[PDB]
């Protein structure tokens, strides 16, 4: 399916079609902003 787990091509590569996001200024935000691996995901979420 669309999400095969925490690690998925749709999740790993933020296509313009599939938009994933989270709540800014929260523990999730701190968690994604903490790791450099998740920095791409943070760049994808930051706008949405």
């Amino acid at each position: 399916e669309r999400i095969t787990g925490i690690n998925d091509p749709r999740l790993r590569n933020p296509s313009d079609k599939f938009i994933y996001a989270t709540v800014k200024q929260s523990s999730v935000d701190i968690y994604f902003r903490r790791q450099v691996e998740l920095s791409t995901m943070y760049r994808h979420m930051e706008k949405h």
Binding site: Q25, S26, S27, D29, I30
Partner: protein, 49 residues
């Protein structure tokens, strides 16, 4: 709320409850100051007394 009420039942302490002002859980940041950073949110409410 039920957990807090049950805690107030087990432990004799009463409770005054209120919602946080910013509406966020907690974070550490400084808007206008590069020198020092401060907590905001319920965490900030806890550290501010």
């Amino acid at each position: 709320v039920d957990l807090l009420i049950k805690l107030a039942r087990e432990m004799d302490f009463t409770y005054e409850v209120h919602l946080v002002a910013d509406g966020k859980f907690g974070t550490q940041e400084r808007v206008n100051n590069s020198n020092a950073a401060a907590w905001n949110g319920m965490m900030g409410e806890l550290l501010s007394g």
